[PDB]
Write a protein that binds this ligand. Sequence first.
Ligand code: NAG
Ligand code: NAG
Ligand code: NAG
Ligand code: NAG
Lengths: 665, 431, 431, 229, 233
Amino acid sequence: KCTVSHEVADCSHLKLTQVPDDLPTNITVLNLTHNQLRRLPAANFTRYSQLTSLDVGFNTISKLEPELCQKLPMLKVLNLQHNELSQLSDKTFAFCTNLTELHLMSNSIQKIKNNPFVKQKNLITLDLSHNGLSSTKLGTQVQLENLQELLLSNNKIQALKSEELDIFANSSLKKLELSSNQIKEFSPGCFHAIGRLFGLFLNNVQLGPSLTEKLCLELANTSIRNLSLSNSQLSTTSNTTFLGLKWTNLTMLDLSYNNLNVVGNDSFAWLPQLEYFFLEYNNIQHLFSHSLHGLFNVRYLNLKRSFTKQSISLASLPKIDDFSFQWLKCLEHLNMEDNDIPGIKSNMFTGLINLKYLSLSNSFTSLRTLTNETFVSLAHSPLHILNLTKNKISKIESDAFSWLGHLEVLDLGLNEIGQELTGQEWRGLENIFEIYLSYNKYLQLTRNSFALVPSLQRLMLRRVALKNVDSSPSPFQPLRNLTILDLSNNNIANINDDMLEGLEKLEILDLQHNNLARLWKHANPGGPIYFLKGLSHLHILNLESNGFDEIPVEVFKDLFELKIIDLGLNNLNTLPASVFNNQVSLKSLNLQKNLITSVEKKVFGPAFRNLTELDMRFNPFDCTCESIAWFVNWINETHTNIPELSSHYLCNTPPHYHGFPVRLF
Amino acid sequence: SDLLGFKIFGMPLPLYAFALITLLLSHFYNALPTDIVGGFAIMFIIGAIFGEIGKRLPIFNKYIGGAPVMIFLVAAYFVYAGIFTQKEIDAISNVMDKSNFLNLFIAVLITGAILSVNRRLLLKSLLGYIPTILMGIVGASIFGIAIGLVFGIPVDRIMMLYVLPIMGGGNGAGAVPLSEIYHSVTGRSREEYYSTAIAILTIANIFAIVFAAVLDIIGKKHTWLSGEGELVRKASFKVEEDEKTGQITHRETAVGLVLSTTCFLLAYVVAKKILPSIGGVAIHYFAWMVLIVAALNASGLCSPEIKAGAKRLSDFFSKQLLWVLMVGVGVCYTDLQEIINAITFANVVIAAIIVIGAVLGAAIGGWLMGFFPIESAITAGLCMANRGGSGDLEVLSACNRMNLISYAQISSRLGGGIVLVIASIVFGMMI
Amino acid sequence: SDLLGFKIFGMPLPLYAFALITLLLSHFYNALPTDIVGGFAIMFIIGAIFGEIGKRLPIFNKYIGGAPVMIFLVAAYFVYAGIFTQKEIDAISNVMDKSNFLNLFIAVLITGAILSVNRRLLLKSLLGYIPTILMGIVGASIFGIAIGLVFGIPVDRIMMLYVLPIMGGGNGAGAVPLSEIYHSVTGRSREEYYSTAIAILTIANIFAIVFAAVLDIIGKKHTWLSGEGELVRKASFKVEEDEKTGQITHRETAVGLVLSTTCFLLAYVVAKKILPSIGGVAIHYFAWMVLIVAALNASGLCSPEIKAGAKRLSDFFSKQLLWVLMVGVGVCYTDLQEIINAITFANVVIAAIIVIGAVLGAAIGGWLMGFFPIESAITAGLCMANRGGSGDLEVLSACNRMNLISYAQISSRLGGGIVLVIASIVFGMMI
Amino acid sequence: EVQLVESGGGLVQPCGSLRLSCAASGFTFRNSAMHWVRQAPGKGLEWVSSIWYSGSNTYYADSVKGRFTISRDNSKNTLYLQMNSLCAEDTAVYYCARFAGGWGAYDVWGQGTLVTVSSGGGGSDIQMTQSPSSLSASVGDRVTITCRASQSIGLYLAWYQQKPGKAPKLLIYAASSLQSGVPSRFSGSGSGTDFTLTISSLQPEDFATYYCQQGNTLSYTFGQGTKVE
Amino acid sequence: EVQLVQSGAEVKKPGESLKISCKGSGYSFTNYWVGWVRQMPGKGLEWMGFIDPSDSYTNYADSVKGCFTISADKSISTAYLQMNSLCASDTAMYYCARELYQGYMDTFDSWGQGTLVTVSSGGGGSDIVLTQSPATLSLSPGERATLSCRASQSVSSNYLAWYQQKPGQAPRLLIYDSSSRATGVPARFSGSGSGTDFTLTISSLEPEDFAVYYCHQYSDISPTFGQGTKVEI
Ligand SMILES: *[C@@H]1O[C@H](CO)[C@@H](O)[C@H](O)[C@H]1NC(C)=O
Ligand SMILES: *[C@@H]1O[C@H](CO)[C@@H](O)[C@H](O)[C@H]1NC(C)=O
Ligand SMILES: *[C@@H]1O[C@H](CO)[C@@H](O)[C@H](O)[C@H]1NC(C)=O
Ligand SMILES: *[C@@H]1O[C@H](CO)[C@@H](O)[C@H](O)[C@H]1NC(C)=O
């Protein structure tokens, strides 16, 4: 009904036939979707005569009032939903000069005036959907140049006629939409009796190789840049498939979901520049060397699931001839997600020069191990990011990434890696910032396991079953600029004090789901282990679900910038006093599902001063006057956000006060 | 007499007044050591004053037993009325029940009596005693069933509830084992039976005291009935064999006490571990006590001076420490509360008739078979009816016949065993 | 032969063999009544055999102490080696702590010792003789404290553990009551005190025996400080009239018990409720018993027959029942390691210095109150520095002086209570 | 007459050790047979062990035979109970009492210490619940089993089927929704918080209990208890 | 094809160790992990820990390390789970499984036949069993109590004691022998009975007499107390 007074009014599902005039005079936005109305009362609209946005949905009206548009030239966008009028007077369009967006959905419209757009040619986008047409007759004369997006989806047109496009002979369009409308024939001169069509969309429409070849001629000497076509049933391609395209300068091309099978040699040589190129979900079986010849200027090439699924019964073996990418002299972004390449040939990526981001996630059906020269084809490309997720990589031989000199983000996570990290495996690397090894089988760490790569900033070891991590020289010692370290879910048992030394740059530490309860128990031999020492910059520390039941008071001495500390899911019952004193700047606390009972400033002294959010959502509170009563005062007087403070924070110890919100001291 | 030359328990009025002031201070300040040394003080003071009072009350001096009976009734009333502080009750209990000074008393009396008799008169005396107690039980049962018919109580109820607990040994052995046997046989409630059995038992104990005093009076009037002292007719006592005894110093008295304690220890060991129950009959250790001391006397181990010393120790206990024992028995082994809560005309009449029937039966058996009636009714007729060893001490003291404590203990324990057997028969036989 | 006729505790050997068989049967079957009767039954047996062993030993009986010392040493060894089955330990601890027969024994000894003194003798001795006793005490105390500071022994330890036990009535009445007072007043363990006191006591007894002959020789050499066996100087004492005692029946001996516990009861009431602390110092009820019995003796309420009555009872306890108490003391009080640690050169010279101090203090006091110092020294200090009654005759037989036996009795008996009072004072004051 | 236990107590992990004491004072500690009596919370008393003076006879309750050890030190007036291989059931208040024999059974009772032996509740697991937990549907039906995870375990849930008296021994789902080598006609799906296993049609052999684990942490957590179907 | 074989069942007294052996046949066993799963009867599977036989690296879970320990050796090709100190609540069906790492998670491919370790106290002992009949009493201040206690067999020499226990307090002796009263007890408490049956009757209850009462026998060398009867208002 009424939105907050940001010049906007919103009405949905109110289903009222008389608008509420209580809306402020100055507001200028109104939607009336999911409502029904007969006639527009201009008097209520006259109060807020300024109305840039007028939206109506799910209503049937014979015709809009021109007097309303005479009242409101300032209208900018008009949306129609489920109104079946076939012809509208052009005076409404003329009066609403500022109208720049017109929407036709669920209308079954059939006729428009020849000159509705004498001065409201301004509208950038025109859409015709859920309507049945066979010709594009809009205006008998050239106009409507400012129109840039024409939508003809959900239409029954079957052929394109040049005479119908006379209005757009002078008009230039960023993109023309003909998707979801099967066209079996294109009359010649249709794309020449039309202005600069920067784009053209033919999706979910039956074209096939034969017709598209004719369409290739039809686009000669045309200012086309955005040609996209999907589900065209393009089984294969030949040299004449894109022959006549040489007489234009395309920029992007889309062939997604066209289940294409075979690309002939040099099938794309008539595209001297093509910045973007889409080839995904296509049943390709084999790439010839010269299949991709002539792609001088390409920035982005996508091959996500662009190959035939492996079938051992059929011995499908979707195979890549080497040097097939050697002509992509400008390629920067190559994607090969969810593919079934049998393995890496020695010269797959030979010739790549500007290659920046290469993703091989789930690209190889059989990549057991990485050898000395498994990436030798990449020796001449500044590959900043390489992605090897989901490839069941059993083992990494040493010097396997020697060829990657400029690499900075390597994602070996989510594989099948069982290996002793001898350190020599990373020798060639110079500038890596992040290494993802999460979700693997097991790593056996050594003292010199990361010495070859002191450039690291992010080491993600999540659920990887670190062996020998309690070695006396910390395996993380050579790392110096590490900022994010993650050892979560590893169920680590014991940790040496030396593990985190010199890591002054360590900002984020994560140790959730680890069995470190022993190391802080008082009766632990050798005393409690203080692995959190010297951590000057630690911002976010997570220790969820560790079995903790006793915190030594001096573990957080060096945590001078600790912003968020999480200790939920543990078994804390009495955290001792003066434990958060050095935590001068703390913003968020989390102690949910612990066994804490008493809340008191002797232990939460500096902690509760200036927080942003606190969380204790399930605990066995003893709601007696001795302990909780102070906290109840702090609850009702403090502006720190306490989510679910009522329904969840409950007490039980007092049997009489069992199940009672802590709010009720 | 003179207010200052009069003697209470051998003490003059000023000295005994000092002692009484001590007792009153202990009572009012509620300060009392709960042990032997603090328990004896109470017992001597109270026993002395009431024994002197009891011996001088006109109708009470002879007809109702005199000093020990007075002391017993007064102590029972005092514990009933709550005059005794809790600490006094605890001290007297510690002397009597905890430390078993009663057991020491009975052991010393038994040793003194048995060790001071001719060795050849022993078995001849005992062989006729058992039929006496048995047909005394028979006579008591006859009179009990007669009075039960008079009050219409069925003969089975009479036998299970009155005649058996009365003729039984007492609370420790004679009212607890009766309860166990009754519960085992008829399957009814146990503690219900025990509660009324102990009440009837105490009632007949009181009547045994009174009848013992009456029988003493009768024996005084009729010489032929009571042969004062030994119960045997003494027709064979014309021999009167005796041997000379040298002067006995303190050491023989201590030797007598040693013999008493060690013969009790041997009897306890026997009756607990060696021969717990001959046949199916349980045997109290005081039965073996008599057998052990009799064997020791026949064995000739002890010189006559030792026997004389034991006799002197028995005299010291029986004539000096008696009133203390009466205070103790009144306080510990007689709860006036239950007898008050269970007093009625029917119970009193039945108990009186049962006791007098026992007395008549025992007298008939004694005179029929070579025993003086009175001395064979005080023992084996009354010492059977009363409540345990405390009952025997009470009854004999009221008769001024402590020469028969051996016969009294034989009667009490052996009759307890026989009555237990009779119960194990009659519980099934009636039910 | 001698093997049938040899006497143990006044019992022929076969009779004691019977008793020992009883004890062994009880030990084997582990059946024993944990009360007075069983406790006496085992403690008489053990005490009898081991006191006969201790008495019939050439050097032991004359010097170390004889039957009491051997008895309690052997009982302590039996406990230490775990020979007693747990039930005998329970029986002995019962008849000494829960029954508290120990307090009865000590009360009987105190009253029999003090009340037996002739009233005229007590009043005359309170004039000038008792001052010699107390000045002997203080002289022994100062000499002991000097020699203690020589050896570095602390002042309090010298005053409580050496001077008081030496100036006692021995282990009977004067080393056990001292231990009880020490445990009640100070609060720490009494095993330590008694164990380390009995050794010093026996050593002092030896030195008293020697110094008796030494003083006899000194009196032979020099005459001005010597007398010919007469305590008082230049005083005729022409006629002293002593009341005759008619006869001692058993009744008066029983009156001994009445006064024994009654005085104890009054002392307990006073020291627990009436006058818990006469100054800032608590007084144990044993001191109050001593004062009360002395006051009762002075008041003359007790007839001369009763006075001898209590003395007769105390003789029975102190000569016949002492062995039982000594078995109990060996079990409950002795710690053999402490006794072994006590016998050393430092202690055997400290005891001799203490006895010398007693001798000089007694002599100077006796000269200040008109006695011959050499007999004054013996009677006031040497009779005091003994094992009570046992050591007086031995010391006065070491010298050729028997006419002073009355003063020796006064010293031992009544100073045994004076020292109890002084020791209660000292235990409170020093700690 | 006053006895204080005042030793041990507190928390001990199971299969651990503990030592107790009793500093008896005010009575002859030696010469007294001493006993240990424990009382589990809300339950009755239960004897533990006994010892004579001088350690002559040591006896133990049949429950604690061989795991406990009682010893006394008379010279210090102290009674030691040495506990080995503690478990959950051996949690109680442990009184030490003096057994005086016939004259008083347990006359002097100490102030017992409270010994709690239990695990700390490590909680390092991801809670897993089979929410409906139905049972024994008819043959040929389409059965749906839902495995609910406390945290987002991702596509790392495996389904295990256990015969009523045999080993589970049957991995069914390598990841979520992926058959193992052997079976068929099983359809699983789900991601994140919730998961679903569906059988095409029940068979006589497929009438047994199931299970789900998470492979998201190296501390796996099988379902608390699943369908008995 | 892969065969995991465990040893047969065991029965043991609490407080003693036990070694369980799991032998793998039909594969390398030097690279595949072996985990241990415990299943209490009628309960869900519980995970204990896994061992890597390649270098005997062990990773216990959730404080299992305290009571258990896992070891394995190359040549015999067998993994051992050893209980440090068995006791009750460990009676469970112990499985060993090969851990395959299929998909991208760890999957227990093949399981052993399982070992059914059942720990039994095996008490018996013919101990005197005391059962106090009225499990609770609800009485007003002034009236009787008449508690009860029944023995398994005869209690020799009437060795029986009754203790009063206030909440949060050490018990207090009332009737030390079957009939004799303790020192400080009032006159209203009074036991009775012998043989296999005993009663403790309170003549007239008091506001401070409301507690729980225990029947205790000490005839043999195995003193056994009683369950407990509560006297409430
Ligand atoms: C627009 O109208 C609302 C409603 O009265 C008013 O609160 C708001 O201040 C107006 N905006 C301006 C810019 O005045
Ligand atoms: C491409 O196809 C055309 C078909 O007209 C053919 O003439 C030409 O030779 C082909 N080029 C090749 C195969 O390189
Ligand atoms: C690319 O094609 C467009 C379309 O005709 C043309 O205007 C432009 O000049 C061409 N670029 C070059 C470099 O010739
Ligand atoms: C291949 O790997 C081996 C193994 O050490 C190495 O010696 C050799 O130099 C490698 N060759 C290349 C071309 O990387």
